[PDB]
Amino acid sequence: MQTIKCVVVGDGAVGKTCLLISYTTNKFPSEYVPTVFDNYAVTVMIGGEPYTLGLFDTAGQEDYDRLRPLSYPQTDVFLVCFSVVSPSSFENVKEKWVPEITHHCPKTPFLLVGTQIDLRDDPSTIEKLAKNKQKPITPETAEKLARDLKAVKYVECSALTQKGLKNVFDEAILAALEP
Amino acid sequence: ARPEIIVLREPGATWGNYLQHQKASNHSLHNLYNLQRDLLTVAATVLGKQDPVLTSMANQMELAKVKADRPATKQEEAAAKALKKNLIELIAARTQQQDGLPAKEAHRFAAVAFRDAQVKQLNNQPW
Ligand SMILES: Nc1nc2c(ncn2[C@@H]2O[C@H](COP(=O)(O)OP(=O)(O)O)[C@@H](O)[C@H]2O)c(=O)[nH]1
Numbered sequence: 001m002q003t004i005k006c007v008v009v010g011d012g013a014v015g016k017t018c019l020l021i022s023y024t025t026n027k028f029p030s031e032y033v034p035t036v037f038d039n040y041a042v043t044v045m046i047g048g049e050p051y052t053l054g055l056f057d058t059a060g061q062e063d064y065d066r067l068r069p070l071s072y073p074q075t076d077v078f079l080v081c082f083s084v085v086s087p088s089s090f091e092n093v094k095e096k097w098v099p100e101i102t103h104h105c106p107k108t109p110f111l112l113v114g115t116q117i118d119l120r121d122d123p124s125t126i127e128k129l130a131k132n133k134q135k136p137i138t139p140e141t142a143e144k145l146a147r148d149l150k151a152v153k154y155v156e157c158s159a160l161t162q163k164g165l166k167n168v169f170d171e172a173i174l175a176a177l178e179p
Numbered sequence: 180a181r182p183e184i185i186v187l188r189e190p191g192a193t194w195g196n197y198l199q200h201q202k203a204s205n206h207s208l209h210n211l212y213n214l215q216r217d218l219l220t221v222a223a224t225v226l227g228k229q230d231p232v233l234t235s236m237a238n239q240m241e242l243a244k245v246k247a248d249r250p251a252t253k254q255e256e257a258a259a260k261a262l263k264k265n266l267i268e269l270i271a272a273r274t275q276q277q278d279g280l281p282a283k284e285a286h287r288f289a290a291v292a293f294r295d296a297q298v299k300q301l302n303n304q305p306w
């Protein structure tokens with residue numbers, strides 16, 4: 001069977017693990033959220049052909065910087081993640097994540113993925129963001145960064161509401177089946 | 180622009196069914212995965228289930244065998260060579276963090292703790 005290996009990468013607390021659990025189980029986790037997603041593989045039918053899809057989470061904290069890339073070999077697509085209510089995480093896409101994956105997997109395509117979009121329209125998050133100056137990241141400014149850093153595209157989702165969730169992984173599968 | 184994509188979700192740990200077990204001829208990347216898994220399990224034993232990331236990564240070294248084996252690159256074989264040293268440095272750093280230990284004492288503890296746990300693991304490999 002042909003195999004798609006997808007690796008999810010990004011800052012701590014952006015929602016990497018929950019995005020993976022909500023997508024694979026169709027449930028948002030509150031009771032069991034490991035730091036790194038449990039081992040997962042599934043059958044995907046793509047144009048009548050069966051593919052193995054393997055989804056790999058990572059630990060984004062700098063303590064693991066020398067251990068994290070052990071899971072990069074043979075990766076077919078990366079998901080580079082940031083929360084749309086964390087400008088800090090958006091910044092690290094440019095300065096840490098894309099430099100990291102392109103140093104190890106220099107021709108492997110990647111999507112830029114915005115997470116937690118249900119917090120864009122939640123006052124307390126905007127309230128907290130107004131203090132020390134920040135606003136949520138918009139699809140516009142995020143699409144620019146994706147053009148700049150040569151991501152396949154920008155996609156967006158909420159693990160909590162499941163909005164856009166299916167599409168993120170459809171696009172990833174497509175980006176994996178490429179030149 | 181787009182094929183019909185249907186994901187066949189299944190409940191539970193099905194992933195073991197998807198592993199490709201057949202070894203490459205020279206320089207098996209899969210064998211590399213096995214050694215790295217063994218090293219990560221040793222560091223997880225030392226840190227004593229205070230750090231579940233190491234165990235999760237060991238688990239991933241198995242999951243990684245969903246991709247068919249091939250000969251390893253030089254960056255991959257060097258990474259597997261550098262891994263022990265890097266795990267010891269993590270343990271060391273952690274021991275300065277949690278405990279009061281000065282860096283050189285922490286490193287010494289880490290090297291010895293790792294060496295000894297590695298020996299126990301090797302001597303507990305089943306027949
Ligand atoms: N409101 C909301 N919260 C989320 C979402 N995804 C994750 N979270 C929360 O963000 C925190 C970190 O999520 P986690 O999956 O562990 O992030 P990770 O460190 O990148 O793996 C947790 O408290 C989650 O409940 C989301 O889509 N919406």
Ligand SMILES: [Mg+2]
Pocket residue numbers: 016017018034035036037057058
């Ligand atoms: Mg996580």
